[PDB]
Amino acid sequence: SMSMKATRLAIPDVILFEPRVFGDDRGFFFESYNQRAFEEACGHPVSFVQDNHSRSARGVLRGLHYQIRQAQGKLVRATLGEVFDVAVDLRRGSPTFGQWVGERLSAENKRQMWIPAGFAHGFVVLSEYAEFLYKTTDFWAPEHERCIVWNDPELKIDWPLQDAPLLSEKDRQGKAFADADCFP
Amino acid sequence: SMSMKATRLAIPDVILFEPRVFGDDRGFFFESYNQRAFEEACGHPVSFVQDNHSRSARGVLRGLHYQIRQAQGKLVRATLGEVFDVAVDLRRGSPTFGQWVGERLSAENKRQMWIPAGFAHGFVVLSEYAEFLYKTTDFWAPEHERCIVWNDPELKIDWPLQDAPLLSEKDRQGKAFADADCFP
Ligand SMILES: Cc1cn([C@H]2C[C@H](O)[C@@H](COP(=O)(O)OP(=O)(O)O)O2)c(=O)[nH]c1=O
Ligand SMILES: Cc1cn([C@H]2C[C@H](O)[C@@H](COP(=O)(O)OP(=O)(O)O)O2)c(=O)[nH]c1=O
What we know:
homodimer, six-stranded antiparallel sheet, five-stranded antiparallel sheet, 2 helices, binds thymidine-5'-diphosphate, isomerase, lipopolysaccharide biosynthesis
């Protein structure tokens, strides 16, 4: 007699989902994705073709990522630990171009963020370790991958970090927002 | 060179998958599903409509489950702990009717099993806890759910468990193979 919750964020095309969880004498059960319910909430058809799975230590930051062609909508969640997850609008024609929203997603709260094509995405690990799962609307295309650097001074993203983040080299070498390839 | 691995089991429609895992000083990354790679391995198109997530304590056994109409193919894996996973051929006309295959799937080995429509499915938890994920080709339909009891004496499933399993009331009340609704 409860149900899945869907809430549009300050940038309305980004949606926060919360599944209905059933507990019992064995442990728990929930639907982590349902095509019908998801499409009703979004307002249009979306099909996914790839699922990705990462594990990251405390302080690791991955992002800010997007594919400029073969763009990927992303439905993301955390199945171990806790992350702060961020979406940045990179559509030049949008009234919220260059704005961002962020939410805490954890194994415990079971919250998910749907981040459509046209956005950049990243997360930082708050717990000892985190494992992060996501579904993508199109395939990996390394030639089309682009990166904006986490601490870009125009975006002004407030990551909850204690010391310097642990970054890959590609991410450490991300471009400035002012130099970045953006969507129409 | 390394890549995704796929191996047909003794009932050849059941496929054991193992992803290629990329490790670095942050942790790891892998594709847990890729529709191209999957369809190429099984030899036909597939569409998944629901993802499910459960948590279960040591000794818990769920199964043996199937839907007789709106039948669901299932791609299953473990993201925490270890289970013994079982697929049973319930297609009365099949040359392997009433046979079963089983494999150990764990968070660490990352193995997955593809169990097509027409099979019954079950697993037993061997670790402190296990979290089990699965994708389905059709939606949950409780009116069409059926169950065969875990210890049916004709199927003769060799569960690698020491003491008795913990079952739900539904699963304790599973039908005998001899009395069960089967597929043609
Ligand atoms: C995003 C992605 C990465 N990968 C591979 C490429 C890399 O070898 C590894 C990790 O990706 P990435 O974080 O880009 O690593 P690196 O900083 O070393 O380039 O996973 C896939 O196979 N599929 C994918 O969809
Ligand atoms: C399999 C499944 C179960 N459920 C619900 C039905 C139940 O209320 C709960 C647990 O499933 P189940 O184990 O079938 O019920 P029970 O615990 O009574 O044996 O999850 C879904 O919402 N979607 C699904 O796909």
